[PDB]
Design a protein around this ligand. Sequence first.
Ligand code: VO4
Ligand SMILES: [Mg+2]
Ligand SMILES: [Mg+2]
Length: 298
Amino acid sequence: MEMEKEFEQIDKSGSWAAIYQDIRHEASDFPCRVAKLPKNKNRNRYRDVSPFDHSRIKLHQEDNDYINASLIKMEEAQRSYILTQGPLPNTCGHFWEMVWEQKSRGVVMLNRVMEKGSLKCAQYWPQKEEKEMIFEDTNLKLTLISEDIKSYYTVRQLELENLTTQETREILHFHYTNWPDQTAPESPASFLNFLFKVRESGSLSPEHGPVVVHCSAGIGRSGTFCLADTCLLLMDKRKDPSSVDIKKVLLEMRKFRMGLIQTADQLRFSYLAVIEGAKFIMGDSSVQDQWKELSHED
Ligand code: VO4
Ligand SMILES: [Mg+2]
Ligand SMILES: [Mg+2]
């Protein structure tokens, strides 16, 4: 309720840029010494996007444990996320090793492999059932099991096999294919429809390891997704929408990974998504069918 008042004040005063720059100025700053080691230069997609040492995910190999990935551990909300860059051609083995070792059940992908004429992500999952991928460095096998393609997102069932142990796991892939870099989604409705398909999959359950979330850098669209989910979960826990302070939640998230939410419009969208999602949290279950309709997923 009180985020709604703040939304109006910021809008009718046109101060989203200043509000967002405030968050940037107050955000935590922690060292990234491991990410900056010369042996890890080719493991980083962007020179200026690095995991903090204190929250980085360590791979369980002894040669080089480095991956550009952060554990966002939201203590009060009791949910964790792994935010990571889009894998590089040499880090797709590391990416699936991380998924395996962290016992993630779901991967949320918010970018496309090619954006604005550039390769933003390696093709790290198989596109055809009969063309499985084997990651020889990490001894993992990945098979496409099935694929449900909708108008602006795709859900895939993957089988991930630890070839050392021959243990197998189902990994769910939630691929938002309609969300351009540095922008807000089309509508809260289509975003919330997607978020709630991730939730209903069980991939966010505490019984599993943290969901893996990535875009190209793992901060902008990835930060928007996590901020909206954590805010909705916080108000759900308290059944009190007015108790949620969005900027404080984002600032808390930015203790674990730098640059989360990259534009003022993405921040503004985050308010809109949470305000609209609160309708469902607070007991208007019919609104979820309305999101499905408005998102035109077929
Ligand atoms: O690829 V993202 O720029 O939305 O961090
Ligand atoms: Mg590379
Ligand atoms: Mg690779």
